[PDB]
Amino acid sequence: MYEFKDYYQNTVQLSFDDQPFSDSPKHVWVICRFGGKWLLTEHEDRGYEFPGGKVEPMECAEEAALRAVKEETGARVKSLKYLGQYKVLGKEKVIVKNIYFADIEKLEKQADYFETKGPVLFHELPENLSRNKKFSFIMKDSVLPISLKKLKESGWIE
């Protein structure tokens, strides 16, 4: 279990156990890999980030993860694996996000990318994420390097 601060100095509680903070998380975050490259999305406001979204009515976290990937990158998932879960303690409300790993099979053409500029492919993520103004704040805290290390240790990536 990890406890640290996010980009906006809110307390973040991170764990790689099976849903320890909530069995009903309202949000999802999907770390995507298409072959040997990282599949990201470009949010119209935030910038470069891994696909994510809110759990919509009658959906489970896994279905919300598959939908977020399609809505933001137009991609189809070959294998969706649960990585971990995190809780953000803010001002208005606490948000529980489920972290998923998605092995991307293909990228299909989409008519509407929603509030995103479409799929973005990176051979490897840049070193200066926290200082990179083109990237989203959700990629600018420890959630990302810790989750990538656990993904590297799990043996799911190549």
Can you describe what's shown?
The protein is built from two helices and nine strands. The chain is of the alpha+beta class. It has a single domain, classed as Nucleoside Triphosphate Pyrophosphohydrolase, CATH 3.90.79.10. Strands 1, 2, 3, 4, 5, 6, 7, 8 and 9 form a nine-stranded mixed β-sheet that branches. It is globular. The protein starts with a strand and ends with a helix. This is Putative 8-oxo-dGTP diphosphatase YtkD. InterPro entries: Nudix_hydrolase (IPR020476), NUDIX_hydrolase-like_dom_sf (IPR015797), NUDIX_hydrolase_CS (IPR020084), NUDIX_hydrolase_dom (IPR000086), Nudix_YtkD (IPR014078).
The profile of the biggest β sheet is:
9 strands, mixed
Q: What's the helical proportion of residues?
A: 10-25%
Instruction: Write the CATH architecture name.
Output: Alpha-Beta Complex
Number of domains: 1
CATH topology, anyone?
Answer: Nucleoside Triphosphate Pyrophosphohydrolase
Q: How much beta, percentage-wise?
A: 35-45%
Radius of gyration equals 15 Å
Assigned CATH superfamily: Nucleoside Triphosphate Pyrophosphohydrolase
Broad shape: globular
CATH top level assignment: Alpha Beta
Give the ordered list of helices and strands: EEEEEEHEEEH
Distance between the termini: 26 Å
- Overall number of strands: 9
Number of helices: 2
Strand pairing plus helix content: what structural class?
alpha+beta
